[PDB]
Design a protein that fits this description.
Chains A, B: One of its GO terms (molecular function) is structural constituent of ribosome. Two copies of one chain form a homodimer. In chain A, 27% of the residues lie in helices and 34% in strands. By secondary structure, chain A is an alpha+beta fold. In chain A, strands 4, 5, 6, 7 and 8 form a five-stranded antiparallel sheet that branches. Chain A has a three-stranded antiparallel sheet with strand order 1-3-2, covered by helices on one side. In chain A, strand 2 (45-53) and strand 3 (56-63) form a beta hairpin. The interface between A and B is small, with 10 and 9 residues.
């Protein structure tokens, strides 16, 4: 993978969350879709859908707000050019409940720190969400 | 892997260590030879050799003693029927220096706890030596 397009997606979600948008759109890709599935699965966004516009693939993300407040507190792109963050299977962080989610790019795909541990794999930490 | 023949090999080493014999011989096997290598590599035994006697593979193990004192303090078979000890890659023990070595059967072969961590694998803990 490459974290630049990932930084782009995260920046857009960040910005949309600030001004409280109900949705946002970003060019689709497999990894971006894998990230959206995780955010959705972990209750950070409400939903997402793949859409095509002028034959261009797009991911439409629906943000989630509790009774007026933002559900996403922060999103950060981690491993990046010049500052790679790789972790062996044994070193995948055990992230406490309530402290967020680490997203790893692994040989078995994009997984959360919790999935990586159950699957017994390490990988590149590409993002953190809280 | 089957642990009984491992128990049997470790028992013979323990007995020979108690009365302070220079060496012992046990029927050879892949796993048994793998344990011998690790024991030799980790400084617990002096050396070992494979020979075929009357068309039967034999592992001759040479014990090590400091100026008369024992080098092996304890060695036992761990995972066994009714007491299986399995560890995921993330939970492979971090054995401090001076506390011994855990030996596990992994999909990548018989490895010490340190090698399993380095290789990104979990497994069944078959023996422990201190």
């Amino acid at each position: 993978v490459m974290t630049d397009p990932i930084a782009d997606m995260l920046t857009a979600i960040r910005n949309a969350n600030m001004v409280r948008h109900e949705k946002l759109e970003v060019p689709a890709s497999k990894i971006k879709r894998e990230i959206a599935e995780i955010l959705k699965r972990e209750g950070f966004i409400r939903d997402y859908e793949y859409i095509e516009d002028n034959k261009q693939g797009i991911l439409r993300i629906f943000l989630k707000y509790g009774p007026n407040e933002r559900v996403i507190t922060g999103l950060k792109r981690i491993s990046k050019p010049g500052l790679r963050v790789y972790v062996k299977a044994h070193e995948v962080p055990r992230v406490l409940n309530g402290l967020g989610i680490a997203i790893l790019s692994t040989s078995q795909g994009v997984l959360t720190d919790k999935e990586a541990r159950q699957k017994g794999t390490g990988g590149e930490i590409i993002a953190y969400v809280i």
